[model samples]
Every structure is written in structure tokens, then in C-alpha cells.
Target chain A: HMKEESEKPRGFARGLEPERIIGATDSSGELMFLMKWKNSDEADLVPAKEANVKCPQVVISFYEERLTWH
Target chain B: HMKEESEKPRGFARGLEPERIIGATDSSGELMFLMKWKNSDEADLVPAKEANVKCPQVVISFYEERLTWH
Candidate 1:
């Protein structure tokens, strides 16, 4: 256990090509991403906790936006 | 006015093609998405309030998931 202070909002699924990933887990304690299809105009969400170890750079970039301005 | 009960989740941006979308707006009153890189793997949160008009589909799907299968 750690800081129950992740105070983030999030969670969704895969497929359809997420356009952008956004917020966090209020009750789910996970992160949510808002996605738009590159070829379309609809948006969706993805609960990305399933992100594998082999890949997280993109997700990493996400939190970077969240915790910084410098 | 609205019922003030559309307590959904979402919001993110464009580019790189988001892989998935996730959750929502607690105080933000918006929606959050969790995305993944189909070509790769990772997670992110996208605050999807800037989804133009008719901006309730994905966000609505959010609360639906919450009230349904997890």
C-alpha cells in the first residue's frame, strides 16, 4: 500500500484506435483515456492498466503532461 | 436546464491515434479516456469534453459501463 493519493481518474478498453488518453480513477483507482478514431470523429475511453511492461512510453508521456509544466 | 445528473467521464486530444478510452469528470464534470497504442502498448487518460457537440455518446457509454458489467 502507498499514498491513497493517486487522486487520478481513469479506465476504458482497446480497439478502434484511441485518439488521446485523458484522466483518472476516482473509485476505480485507474487511469482513463479519451480516444478518437484517426479515420473518424467519435470518441471513446480505455482503462489502460493492462498496458504491458514491454510498452509504456506513450503512457509515460501521458503522466508527464499531468505532473509537469516545466 | 439539464438534470445535472449526466455525471459522465471523458476528454482528450488528437494525434498519434489513441488506442482506447476510459473514465470521467468528478468535479471537472467531463469524461476521461484510457488509451493504448495498438502498434505498441501503454495507458493514458484523455479528458474528452472538447468533443464538439453531441458530446455525450462516449461519455454516456462510461456511466453505462459503471452501471453494468465490469
Candidate 2:
């Protein structure tokens, strides 16, 4: 576990997406993602700790302005 | 009346909310707020200059992702 500190006001989900994908797999290695809005301060979102291969993957975040179709 | 300018990244309606209530009085001074989203560039939103007594007061802005039970 490494934590250098990623303090950046990111409008889009960057690292989190990959982490989410890897985290969101089911017992059979299936994945999915549920989107919600994060308040502005924590605007820089990351994969939730519970995220895993059985977890959900995110295709897009707010940065691009348009939500990527699921 | 003074106009220097107020530029702050406010997530919820702090100043504008009060202004909206006073303006939205329907001559009686009522208040209401509309929700949409401003691009990250224009994320710092201001009351549309046309706002006045028949306007809306944002109960809350993005700061509280949870909407008020109106």
C-alpha cells in the first residue's frame, strides 16, 4: 500500500476508473459501476476501498462533460 | 449600491439564496431555485442578471448532493 498523496482538482475520474474496473469483478469476474455525484471539495474521486474485480467499472467521469453511454 | 464583484467558488447557494427569496415574492417576495449544471469552466455560477422578485432561491447547490425535501 503506497500513499504519496494525490491532491488534484480533477473534473474527470482518471486513476479511479482503472481501479474500479480491476475491483468490480464478481465471483465469476463480472463487473459493473454505479454512478453518483460527489460534492465539489472531494471532486477528485477514486475507486472506493471495497472496489475489486467483482466491483463496477466507470467509463467516464465529469471531465469530458458528456456521460459515456453504458 | 456598490459593484466591485464577488468571485468565490461556492458550491451551495450562500449569498444568492437570500437574494432569490427577496426577489421571488410574486410582489409578495417568494423564493425558488432551479437546478442544472454549469461546465467546470463556468462552474462559478452567478445569478443571471435578469434575476428578480419572481426568481428562485437555490435551497442548495452541488455542495450538498442531497436535495432538500421541498
Candidate 3:
């Protein structure tokens, strides 16, 4: 399940070309990216689709950008 | 960039049915889920795609399963 947040977290996503990146962020130390989806309320990109997985799927992805101090 | 791990982290992905979940986990507190993809060693699921994002996008998703002690 998703964490209960007082406010929504923000993050970025790729542009229409599917090669360039574009998005936003928030100060909650939490990053959320939302796009055009039917009703799954999840992700539908390369890694998600190529891996054949769906959203709210109890998963964790690791990254190394100095985005969050944690 | 990805984490430099001594061993490959492991996690689960949804099965072909796509409604239920299936996979595995390791003991590093680092859970990973892998599936068929062209060359992008990342996820392809609901939250990712609907977010209009891609793999290795410097992102993080939160979960509340008892799987991880953290």
C-alpha cells in the first residue's frame, strides 16, 4: 500500500519524444510522477512494461542522483 | 546510475495473468524485480508508465509490506 502523506509528492518524467526528460519535484523528500493512465494509478514505461509488471506492485527501485538526502 | 552490489538483488514481478503478484527477495534489504526487456534492465509497470517515466530515471517508490525490516 501507499504511504499516507499530508500532501502529494512530486517528481519528473520523460517528454513526448520518449528520449528526453521533463518533470517536477517537492520538498517532502518524496518524489511522485503522474501521467496519462486509465485507472491503474501506476506507471507504464520501459522498465515497467518490459518487465511486465504493474503499479502499486510492492516494488522498490534504486537510484543514485543526489535527489533525496536519505 | 545503479548500486554496486556484490550480488544481484532479487524481487518479484506480477505473473502473466497480471492481476496477481509473484517473485522473490534477498537479505540485503534491497528488493529487485526483473523481467523480459530489450536491454533496459529496469521495471515496466503501472506506476512507472502512468507516470510517463522510464527506467534508471532516478526515482523511488514507497511500499508498506512486511517484507523489509526497514
Scored by TM-score, the top model is 1
Residue B56 error for model 2, in Å?
Answer: 25
Cα displacement (angstroms), candidate 2, residue B33, comes to: 13
DockQ of 2: 0.01
TM-score chain B for all models.
Answer: 0.36, 0.18, 0.21
Model 3 lDDT per residue over A11-66, tens place = 11322222211222323543332222333344333333212134322223222111
Model 1 lDDT per residue over A49-69, tens place: 443121243444344345311
* lDDT per residue as tens, model 1, B1-70: 1332256422233234443344333235443445433454544455444321223333333433443121
Off by over 4 Å in 3: A1-15, A25-66, B1-10, B13-60, B63-70
Error of 2 at A12 (Å): 20
Off by over 4 Å in 2: A1-31, A34-70, B1-70
- Predicted candidate 3 versus true structure: per-residue lDDT over B2-43, tens digit per residue: 443336432222222222122223225433322223333443
DockQ of 3: 0.06
Q: i-RMS values of the candidates, in order?
A: 15.3, 16.1, 11.0
Best by DockQ: 3
Pick by lDDT: 1 or 3, better one: 1
C-alpha lDDT score of every prediction, in listed order: 0.39, 0.26, 0.28
TM-score for candidate 1, residues paired by index: 0.30
